[PDB]
Amino acid sequence: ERGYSFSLTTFSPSGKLVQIEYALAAVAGGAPSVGIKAANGVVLATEKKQKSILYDERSVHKVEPITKHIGLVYSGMGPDYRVLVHRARKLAQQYYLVYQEPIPTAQLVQRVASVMQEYTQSGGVRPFGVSLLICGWNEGRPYLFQSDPSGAYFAWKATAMGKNYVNGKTFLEKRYNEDLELEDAIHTAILTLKESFEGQMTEDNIEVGICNEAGFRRLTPTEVKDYLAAIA
């Protein structure tokens, strides 16, 4: 049914929105990223491997903060990631202005998923070709979610998106335990990326952020190097 793979507002005779699936394929063809939730928090790691030394590694950061206690990594198109980051930050600020309390992770994920859905309900606009892995800490509990171009959001305990996501999931369910800690989480996420990382993990080739009780913080390259040395 190739005749129904162009319109975003046309159901196929089998009732499938093909363009959303193509956006998800674009997501799966992105840079590998992993996100795992341990009893102490959440860890989001991603492969920031440049095409050459010329690219400035510290110029753009893949793992980005939304609030003091919410972080968010991605897999898929790059430019759409910045738009989603800006909309997530704006939604967090609006929620803070309305309620004076930092936005709960679930509510921010819901609003971001709605924002991504807004780009899938009309022709002439393209769905966000990126999938977001969002970490947050509220009420003494870690929260990890995955928002999709379809607007569907789930509550992943531990997952991997991007290239070789099947390999990342297969590596998980083995090295993942629900009673781990943030350090063990960091180690497991780094190993999971190693299952899909081509080349040496230079401290500038990997970006890791931790969503713990103190909030969300992206690891400095020194800590990434220390964890890589502890792993390798």
Binding site: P65, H86, K90, Q93, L97
Partner: protein, 44 residues
């Protein structure tokens, strides 16, 4: 009036700082506050 103005300015500056990853400047806060207050013609 002052509470809501300060809260909105703080939220805008938090968004700005998150977009820049650098410490916000006092000049930016003064500018945003002055334009917001001038737009309302001193009614805040």
């Amino acid at each position: 009036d002052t509470d809501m103005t300060t809260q909105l300015i703080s939220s805008n500056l938090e968004l700005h700082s998150l977009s820049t990853g650098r410490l916000p400047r006092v000049v930016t806060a003064n500018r945003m506050l002055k334009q917001m207050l001038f737009r309302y013609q001193g009614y805040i």
